Design a protein around this nucleic acid. Structure first.
Ligand SMILES: *O[C@H]1[C@@H](OC)[C@H](n2cnc3c(=O)[nH]c(N)nc32)O[C@@H]1COP(=O)(O)OP(=O)(O)OP(=O)(O)OC[C@H]1O[C@@H]([n+]2cn(C)c3c(=O)[nH]c(N)nc32)[C@H](O)[C@@H]1O
Lengths: 358, 736, 13, 17, 103, 741
RNA sequence: AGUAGUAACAAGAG
RNA sequence: CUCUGCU
């Protein structure tokens, strides 16, 4: 645990809630005013979220999922599924978004377990994760620490505060606006070995007093569902072609890279990625949906899905008609307020409109 | 005795005494569900939360005496605290693991018997056979199937009565088992369930599952029997089919139904062949039902069906020339009839389209408790002589004959709520619906049918609507014989090239025309093992696979169509499609499409790959010259006429230009590779026979014209015609 | 199968 | 002897009273 | 199954404005016979209330407008791409061991 | 190189990849704090759409009521609650004409349901407002409280067991001049009795409880839902029964059918419209919800529809069907918890109940709440706001879809009397309408006619979020149709993972969910294997049931390791006992106990499947091998799973937070009730399997059964003379206890 | 502080 | 000092 020091009592919001008293005992208080229900103050989009997504779509040399062993395959369909699952696991285990899935799931499950078991004490929770490097080694890695505060979580929306301290090699000075909520300390020097030689680099510690709700932790533990949202879609995009060709096209799609889908935009135009790139991109999208989940994301996703259907009808020469398009746009735009993920999705949708009607 | 002691203790407590005394047995159903706790809205979150506390589980108080409070490691298995809202105490999962580890073992030989259904699943999966997996454009249709076949002989109520007998013999009440099946199953179950400590409630629930039939609407693609539905996830997929044969015995009814379906599909497909007998023989020798070859099931399955009979005749097996209807086996002793659909209005002001049999004919009706001789004309019961053993059997035979007559008063006798479409709006069989309705109640039918004067016909006393025998009066054309008149003989027959079955004398016994036109679903998965695997599939599958085959072979199909289209049209791969094309319109559609193809060939440019794909299947049949103009081509699909539009985009046949992909009935069929020689340039020249499509109208050659009347144009002149989805276009009668 | 595509996070120190 | 190969519908009849 | 007392008053009050009693409304609706009331009302309604269809062409959809406040800041519970990890060769295994002793 | 997942739609059509547009991996947006603001906003909005109606004051409850029926015709496209009685009656008449006898047959079916429906039917349903406690209670608990109060008040006509008798008692209660209830106050437990006047009981019998819909996806802003009292639900059940009977007879009404029944019915109907449409006719399909549908479906129009439907029926049947719309037209909406006021300078919290908003000063509120309170103050009465117009989260979904389908049928060419015509599908507030007309102008004219007719009937199409395209692709109740329904797996993602019933039920449910998704939602086999692996991992972590051979440390690890060493056949161990996972695509339909039965050790098999283990607890048959699952969209679903009852079929701890509240007595009463019921089952084993019957008290039935059982056991020799003597003496003692009292 | 967003948590009841 | 973590 962690002695309840002044610094932890402040960072974890100890005794910050007002005392709950009967209304008749405080009706005469001068500034007794209803809670503040002001509209979230809107913010702007920044390139850092796009860089975060770009990295989440990257390939890592270390495997991140070690799945249990299912019953031995007997049916020929089971063998085909096993081969396809081998391809999917090879493509996904090395995805950075899979690392995000694992670290988030571990953090959320540890936080919830500590929250339930130790509801009065500040608990130290290391940020651990497990990978298998491409040489078979099974390195156990530490990302930092989480000091969970008091966790008398009554409602599913009740908040437990925790101080998160993460190591990093990125100087916040470069992009201060991204780290408005962090107090970053320079705590070490890391002698990184590179191709030319060795370079000495500072090592910082991003510290912030974050918070999480019981429902948020519960959905964090189930971040592995993202793996399905992506992989199922990929399978749905493979099976269709395999039905058309009357053959199993998993090998052709993964090894031969015959089929590519428009997956990104560069200055040269639209870039086409293979099935693996598309799988990683969808996995990253689902992972970020889980990480940056919020009512803004849900509302924008629904309304933009409706607009996507309209644009698809336009693309299919179904001469779509609208009764109030400006109303639909206003409904969509009302869901873009603060969350960087939703703003990035809105910019993505704008780009897709630009490249879809040209 | 423990329970009476507990009752005495409860009466001792004042408040519990008041509850017990005041509340009645009827009011128990209400206070039994009296709970302060509310259903958890997100149980997953609560469970994740509660697995972190020490004692999330609740167990009976007795646990405290039959499990140590802590194990050798000191971890507290259970606690003293009492569960909220009950007398159960709190317990940790450690307690459960401890019980499974070093707990009091007992005998479990009874478990397979009480959980018979689950262990039957295990056993029939153990002995199942796995064939190759085939990647095909699977077309799954949503339809009601059975997940629990139940004990067919026993209706739900009989199953409940048997369950009460077996599990709660004293609480049966006044009920007594009458059906012999009830007695035998009750006996065997009681013998098996001897000294079964399992909770009676669980035994009752498992027996309900085992005995009571349960159905479910599920998207399926193979057999609809339970043995195939439970493994539906394993067998049928989006793009693949896993040929699987569940082990164990198979219900004879399911095999009979699947054989009927397979025979119907094979004969319907074989009619459109150039050599129907040889084609039918090949599909019989290449088809398997439920993993069993179809060649060797006919010689061992006597199910009566004009299609089954045609198949048997093709193999030299003696046929019966009989067919089931309303539970009675009908054998046409004399007469002949022709099928033709016709619309009728029922007595409940509902409009039906029923298949009337034109022609005088005579049948012999054989039933389990009745036998009759019938003579009928078109929607007219000329005569009926019944010989039922009891009044109920006589009434059943009379009602079946009445419905089989298809008489107008029969149709107009419908009263009350009778629906001819299920909750999925699928068209039910009108004859079966009428049979069910009239068997439920027949007073109106007999009242509205008519009475005929009857003389003293020896041993043929008349019957009246009230079911009492009468001598002077009787139901029109209905007599009851006491001679117990009571066909099965299998007469050897010769079947010609065109599947016309003739006996020794030479009269046509069976022909493909009288084969049923319904497209039913097999109870057992049917596998076809030729090069084109989809010959005997349903309508949607045939359409999708035909267009997919055209797409795949498009490289050679183009060249064959350009230099030798007659052989392209001959291509057998289009025959099942033609089987879907109505017989009446087959020749005219073929002629129209062939003329359009020839004009497309003659006209320089104007090549349209998508149009050729759309219209090629219709060209298989021999041409029939005509001047009629077709706005759409019709194909039969489960009793509905799907209209493939000649010009434009329709749900049946779609070409997405953005993806350059063709979808049929919502199922992808592939993409068409870009053809530099297409060059549509607006002008199509492959829509109207003898007309060229200039394009958008210009309102100078005429306001608009209809497709059919447009034939008035002689030659050369240009006019505006309303062709397509409200898109008037300019056209001209081709120079030649 | 080795995935491919056409270390400040996890360096060697 | 006399047997029904396949009997559809509910059967019976309420007319008998 | 009668309606009387309090339910009678509630029924009387729960009627269209012109009617005054439940039995009167029942008599009116029982004798009701369609006579083109819907068409007459459709004629009466102003022409402005209509479901005008504006075609959605390739030039119809404008780009979405994003808020123009201060740039959005990181809100994830942990660093995503900037996170640095201190690891060890120790193979051990996932879920095995004491995370603190590993840390 | 900026990767953009949305650009995937440039190649894959939106529908085929619609699953990507669902963020359901993340947590749904929950509601924090009170729902009083949302309820006030709903009441004000409902009264705003009907402001041009007639204002009256109820003579019984004394609350102001607003009647928009036959109000001024709409002059703008905004939602309007001015429904025309003539137009709705005309729509119903034409529905009857086009479907002869539908009303008559439906009325007879409802007649038989009403005859054969018992009070116990009201036990189904959840979170039913309990007027006796002014809070939401389980439907069975609220029903029991209401029955007890009625009995204490002399309403002793409900013991017949028939629902209609209970409704008669409900009316008799409202007609009573006074009422007596029992409430607990702690200051020590005090079973106080409260006397309610006629007007107060009337207000609290028409009251509608309100809360905030939690875990609702696709909406940025939260909305308030409502649950009715016990008096209302009785008539609501019959009304819904009749409306559902009518709906089953309508081709365009897909609400009663659900799941794959719903999808098949919709597919068939859309196919029929595409078929019967003329080839030369231009065809279009409109997708849209109806804006403020619940707020505008006036209950007076529902009364008119019921009265028309019940034409020529027995007067008592008309009464039984028409009572519910009457009560709803005079309904009241509870505000809710209230608000929370904070003082930063003094740093204190307080919660102000919603009952004291009719008098509290307005300076304590922010602007929005200030104006909502100002606008709703006239409607506030005894802590509830009068909500006569509109239908706040009404349960008349069946009746509403009947009205929608009636308007939908109004589009037949025999009714339009023009070239254009329309049909489609209706379900609650959602509709998919197909228009066929020779030209685009005809399509537009038909669209305008349908929209204006809906405005006439009170249905307001949402032009904001509805769009029209060429027939062939559309959307309906989150079902995306693209020339054929496409599987949208993202909807079923939340169902995956640990359900949280118990170890056995949760394994069975997980494997069954994977299998069902393979069958229905196009879950490929490799993805199925993935889902199985991930579910097993999550199951093991949640239940601390990792394999014994593993070194993972958990409070259950020691016992699992000991069991692992104990067993000879490791493969036979269940996953809950550290055994390996033998599941695969082959055997997703087989319960684990049966799958591993042959591999189980004999002693382990006996211990696991010991019927006398204390962990297994069995309630009535209706709660056996079944679970309630909540999908991302739609109401609760009853999912049945195949599971062998073993020691793992235990019950999780029950929320004890009621122990430190004034209402603990209800919990105590529940305990005692169970103590009695379980003993009744000890005397009548079939009570659980099928509901028992009788009029005598439980004690009489049990003692008579004990006596007869003793005599039979003696005759069979199962008990000796002394045992029979003791049983008889105890029975006589029980008789004396009952007599003395 | 911080979570979060139209109202709340930052423990609550004895 | 006791109780509760969906009441
Ligand atoms: O499930 C289908 C069918 O198998 C697919 C099944 N079935 C048929 N036979 C058996 C059987 O022997 N054993 C089992 N277990 N199942 C059997 O029952 C269903 C059959 O109905 P369906 O396929 O939906 O349509 P259809 O085959 O046409 O049945 P139905 O319309 O009731 O007619 C049955 C026979 O009656 C002939 N028929 C009717 N009329 C009025 C006449 C007539 O006036 N003259 C003549 N010559 N024949 C008539 C029908 O043509 C059909 O042959």
């Amino acid at each position: 645990n962690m002695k309840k020091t002044s610094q932890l009592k402040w960072a974890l919001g100890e005794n910050m809630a007002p005392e709950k008293v009967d209304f008749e005992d405080c009706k005469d208080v001068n500034d007794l005013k209803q809670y503040d229900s002001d509209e979230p103050e809107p913010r702007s989009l920044a390139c850092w979220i796009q860089s975060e997504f770009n990295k989440a779509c990257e390939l890592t040399d270390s495997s991140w999922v070690e799945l249990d062993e299912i019953g031995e395959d007997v049916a020929p369909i089971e063998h085909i599924a096993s081969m396809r699952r081998n391809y999917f696991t090879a493509e996904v285990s090395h995805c950075r978004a899979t690392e995000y899935i694992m670290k988030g799931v571990y953090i959320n499950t540890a936080l919830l377990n500590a929250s339930c078991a130790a509801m009065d004490d500040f608990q130290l929770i290391p940020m651990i994760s497990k990978c298998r490097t491409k040489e078979g080694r099974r390195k156990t890695n530490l990302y930092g620490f989480i000091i969970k505060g008091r966790s008398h979580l009554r409602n599913d929306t009740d908040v437990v505060n925790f101080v998160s301290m993460e190591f990093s090699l990125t100087d916040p000075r470069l992009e201060p606006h991204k780290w408005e909520k962090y107090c970053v300390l320079e705590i070490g020097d890391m002698l990184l070995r590179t191709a030319v030689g060795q370079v000495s680099r500072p090592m910082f510690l991003y510290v912030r007093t974050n918070g999480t709700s019981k429902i948020k932790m519960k959905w964090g533990m189930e971040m592995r569902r993202c793996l399905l949202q992506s992989l199922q879609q990929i399978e749905s995009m493979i099976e269709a072609e395999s039905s058309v060709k009357e053959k199993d096209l998993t090998k052709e799609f993964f090894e031969n890279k015959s089929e590519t889908w428009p997956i990104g935009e560069s200055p040269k135009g639209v870039e086409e990625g293979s099935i693996g790139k598309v799988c990683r991109t969808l996995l990253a999208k689902s992972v970020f949906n889980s990480l940056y989940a919020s009512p803004q994301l849900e509302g924008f996703s629904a309304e933009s899905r409706k607009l996507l259907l309209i644009v698809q009808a336009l693309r299919d020469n179904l001469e779509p008609g609208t009764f109030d398009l400006e109303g639909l746009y206003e409904a969509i735009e009302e869901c873009l307020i603060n969350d960087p993920w939703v703003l990035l999705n809105a910019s993505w949708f704008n780009s897709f409109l630009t490249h879809a009607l040209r | 005795m423990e329970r009476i002691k507990e009752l005495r203790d409860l009466m001792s407590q004042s408040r519990t005494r008041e509850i017990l005394t005041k509340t009645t047995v009827d009011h128990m159903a209400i206070i039994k569900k009296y709970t302060s706790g509310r259903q958890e809205k997100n149980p997953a979150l609560r469970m994740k939360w509660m697995m972190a506390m020490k004692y999330p589980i609740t167990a009976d108080k007795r646990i405290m005496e039959m499990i140590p409070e802590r194990n050798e490691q000191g971890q507290t298995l259970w606690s003293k605290t009492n569960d909220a809202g009950s007398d159960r105490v709190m317990v940790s999962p450690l307690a459960v693991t401890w019980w499974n580890r070093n707990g009091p073992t007992t005998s479990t030989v009874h478990y397979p018997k009480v959980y018979k259904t689950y262990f039957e699943k295990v056993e029939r999966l153990k002995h199942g056979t796995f064939g190759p997996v085939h990647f095909r454009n699977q077309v799954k249709i949503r339809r009601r199937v059975d997940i629990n076949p139940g004990h067919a002989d026993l209706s739900a109520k009989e199953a409940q009565d048997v369950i009460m007998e077996v599990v709660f013999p004293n609480e049966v009440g006044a009920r007594i088992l009458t059906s012999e099946s009830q007695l035998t199953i009750t006996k065997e179950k009681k013998k098996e369930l001897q000294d079964c400590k399992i909770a009676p409630l669980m035994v009752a629930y498992m027996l309900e599952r085992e005995l009571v039939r349960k159905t479910r609407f599920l998207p399926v693609a193979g057999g609809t029997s339970s043995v195939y539905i439970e493994v539906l996830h394993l067998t049928q997929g989006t793009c693949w089919e896993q040929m699987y044969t569940p082990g164990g015995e198979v219900r004879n009814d399911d095999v009979d139904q699947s054989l009927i379906i397979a025979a119907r599909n094979i004969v319907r497909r074989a009619t459109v062949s150039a050599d129907p007998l040889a084609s039918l023989l090949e599909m019989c020798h290449s088809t398997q039902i439920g993993g069993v070859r179809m060649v060797d099931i006919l010689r061992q399955n006597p199910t009566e069906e004009q299609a089954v009979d045609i198949c048997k005749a093709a193999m030299g097996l003696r046929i019966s020339s009989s067919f089931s209807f309303g539970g009675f086996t009908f054998k046409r002793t004399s007469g002949s009839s022709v099928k033709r659909e016709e619309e009728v209005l029922t007595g409940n002001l509902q409009t039906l389209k029923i298949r009337v049999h034109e022609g005088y004919e005579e049948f012999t009706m054989v039933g389990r408790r009745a036998t009759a001789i019938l003579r009928k004309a078109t929607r007219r019961l000329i005569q009926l002589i019944v010989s039922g053993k009891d009044e109920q059997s006589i009434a059943e035979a009379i009602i079946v004959a009445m419905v089989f007559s298809q008489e107008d008063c029969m149709i107009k006798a419908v009263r009350g709520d009778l629906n001819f479409v299920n909750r999925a709006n699928q068209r039910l069989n009108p004859m079966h619906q009428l049979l069910r309705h009239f068997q439920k109640d027949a007073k109106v039918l007999f009242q509205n049918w008519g009475i005929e004067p009857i003389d003293n016909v020896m041993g043929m006393i008349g019957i009246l609507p009230d079911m009492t025998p009468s001598t002077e009066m009787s139901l029109r054309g209905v007599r009851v014989s006491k001679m117990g008149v009571d066909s099965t003989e299998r007469v050897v027959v010769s079947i010609d090239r065109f599947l016309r079955v003739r006996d020794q004398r030479g009269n046509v016994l069976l022909s493909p025309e009288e084969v049923s036109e319904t497209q039913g679903t097999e109870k057992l998965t049917i596998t076809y093992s030729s090069s084109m695997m989809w010959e005997i599939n349903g309508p949607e599958s045939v359409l999708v696979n035909t267009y997919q085959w055209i797409i795949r072979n498009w490289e050679n199909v183009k060249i064959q169509w350009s230099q030798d289209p007659t052989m392209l049209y001959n291509k057998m791969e289009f025959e099942p499609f033609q089987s879907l094309v109505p017989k009446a319109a087959r020749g005219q559609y073929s002629g129209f499409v062939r003329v359009l193809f020839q004009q497309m060939r003659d006209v320089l440019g104007t090549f349209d790959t998508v149009q050729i794909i759309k219209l090629l299947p219709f060209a298989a049949a021999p041409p029939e010259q005509s001047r009629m103009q077709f706005s759409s081509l019709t194909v039969n699909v489960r009793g509905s006429g799907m209209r493939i539009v000649v010009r434009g985009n329709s749900p049946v046949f779609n070409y997405n230009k953005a993806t350059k992909r063709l979808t049929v009935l919502g199922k992808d069929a592939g993409a068409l590779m870009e053809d530099p020689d297409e060059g549509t340039a607006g002008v199509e020249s492959a829509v109207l026979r003898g007309f060229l499509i200039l394009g958008k109208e210009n309102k100078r050659y005429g306001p608009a014209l209809s497709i059919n009347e447009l034939s008035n144009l002689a030659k050369g002149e240009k006019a505006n015609v309303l062709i397509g989805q409200g898109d008037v276009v300019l056209v001209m009668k081709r120079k030649r | 199968y080795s995935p491919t595509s056409p270390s400040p996070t996890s360096p060697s120190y | 002897a006399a047997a029904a190969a396949f009997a559809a519908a509910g059967a019976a009849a309420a007319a008998a009273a | 199954f009668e309606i009387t007392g309090t339910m009678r008053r509630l029924a009387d009050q729960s009627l269209p404005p012109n009617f005054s009693s439940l039995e009167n409304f029942r008599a009116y609706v029982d004798g009701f016979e369609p006579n083109g009331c819907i068409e007459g009302k459709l004629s009466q309604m102003s022409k402005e209330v209509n479901a005008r269809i504006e075609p959605f062409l390739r030039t119809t959809p404008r780009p979405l407008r994003l808020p123009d406040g201060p740039p959005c800041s990181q809100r994830s519970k942990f660093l995503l791409m900037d996170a640095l990890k201190l690891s060890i060769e120790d193979p051990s295994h996932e879920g095995e061991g004491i995370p603190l002793y590993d840390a | 190189m900026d990767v953009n997942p949305t650009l995937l739609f440039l190649k894959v059509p939106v529908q085929n990849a619609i699953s990507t547009t669902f963020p359901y991996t993340g947590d749904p947006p929950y509601s924090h704090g009170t729902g009083t603001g949302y309820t006030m906003d709903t009441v004000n909005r409902t009264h705003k759409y009907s402001e041009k109606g007639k204002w009256t004051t109820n003579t019984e409850t004394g609350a102001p009521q607003l009647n928009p029926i036959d109000g001024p015709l709409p002059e703008d496209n905004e939602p309007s609650g001015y429904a025309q009685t003539d137009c709705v009656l005309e729509a119903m008449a034409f529905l009857e004409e086009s479907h002869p006898g539908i009303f008559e047959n439906s009325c007879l079916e409802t007649m038989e349901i009403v005859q054969q429906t018992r009070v116990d039917k009201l036990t189904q349903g959840r979170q039913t407002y309990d007027w006796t406690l002014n809070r939401n209670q389980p439907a069975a608990t609220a029903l029991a409280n209401t029955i007890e109060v009625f009995r204490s008040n002399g309403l002793t006509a409900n013991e017949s067991g028939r629902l209609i008798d209970f409704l008669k008692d409900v009316m008799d209660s409202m007609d009573k001049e006074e009422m007596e209830i029992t409430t607990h106050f702690q200051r020590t437990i005090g079973k106080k009795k409260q006397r309610l006047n006629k007007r107060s009981y009337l207000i609290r019998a028409l009251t509608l409880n309100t809360m905030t819909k939690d875990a609702e996806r696709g909406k940025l802003k939260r909305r308030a839902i409502a649950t009715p009292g016990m008096q209302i639900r009785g008539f609501v059940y019959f009304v819904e029964a009749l409306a559902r009977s009518i709906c089953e007879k309508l081709e365009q009404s897909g609400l009663p059918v659900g799941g794959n029944e719903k999808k098949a019915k919709l597919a068939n109907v859309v196919r029929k419209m595409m078929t019967n449409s003329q080839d030369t006719e231009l065809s279009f399909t409109i997708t849209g919800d109806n804006t403020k549908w619940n707020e505008n479906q006036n209950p007076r129009m529902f009364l008119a529809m019921i009265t028309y439907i019940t034409r020529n029926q027995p007067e008592w049947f008309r009464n039984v069907l028409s009572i519910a719309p009457i009560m709803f037209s005079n309904k009241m909406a509870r505000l809710g918890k209230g608000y929370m006021f904070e003082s930063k300078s003094m740093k204190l919290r307080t919660q102000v109940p919603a009952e004291m908003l009719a008098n509290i000063d307005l300076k304590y509120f922010n602007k929005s709440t200030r104006e909502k309170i100002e606008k709703i103050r006239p409607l506030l009465i005894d802590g509830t706001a009068s909500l006569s117009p509109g239908m706040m989260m009404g349960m008349f979904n069946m009746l509403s879809t009947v009205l929608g389908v009636s308007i939908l049928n109004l589009g037949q060419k025999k009714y339009t009397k023009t070239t254009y015509w329309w049909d489609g599908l209706q379900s609650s507030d959602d509709f998919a309408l197909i228009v066929n007309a020779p030209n685009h102008e005809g399509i537009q004219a038909g669209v305008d006619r349908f929209y204006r007719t809906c405005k006439l009937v009170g249905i307001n199409m949402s032009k904001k979020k509805s769009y029209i395209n060429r027939t062939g692709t559309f959307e309906f109740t989150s079902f995306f149709y693209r020339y054929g329904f496409v599987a949208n797996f993202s909807m079923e993602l939340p169902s995956f993972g640990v359900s949280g019933i118990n170890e056995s039920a949760d394994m069975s449910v997980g494997v069954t969910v994977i299998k069902n998704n393979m069958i229905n939602n196009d879950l490929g086999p490799a993805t199925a294997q993935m889902a199985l692996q991930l579910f097993i991992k999550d199951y093991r972590y949640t239940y601390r049931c990792h394999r014994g051979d593993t070194q993972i440390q958990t409070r259950r690890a020691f016992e699992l390791k000991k069991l692992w060493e104990q067993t000879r056949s490791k493969a036979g161990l269940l996953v809950s006992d550290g055994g390996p996972n033998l599941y695969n695509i082959r055997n997703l339909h087989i319960p684990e106990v049966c799958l591993k039965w042959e591999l189980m050790d004999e002693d382990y098999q006996g211990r696991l499947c010991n019927p006398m283990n204390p962990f297994v607890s069995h309630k009535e048959i209706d709660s056996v091998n079944n679970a309630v699952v909540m999908p991302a969209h739609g109401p609760a679903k009853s999912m049945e799973y195949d599971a062998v009852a073993t020691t793992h079929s235990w019950i999780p701890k029950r929320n004890r937070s009621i122990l430190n509240t004034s209402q603990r007595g209800i919990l105590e009463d529940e305990q005692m009730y169970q103590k009695c019921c379980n003993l009744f089952e000890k005397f009548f084993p079939s009570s659980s399997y099928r509901r028992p019957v009788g009029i005598s008290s439980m004690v009489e039935a049990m003692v008579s059964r004990a006596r007869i059982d003793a005599r039979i056991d003696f005759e069979s020799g199962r008990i000796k003379k002394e045992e029979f003597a003791e049983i008889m003496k105890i029975c006589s003692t029980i008789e004396e206890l009952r007599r003395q009292k």
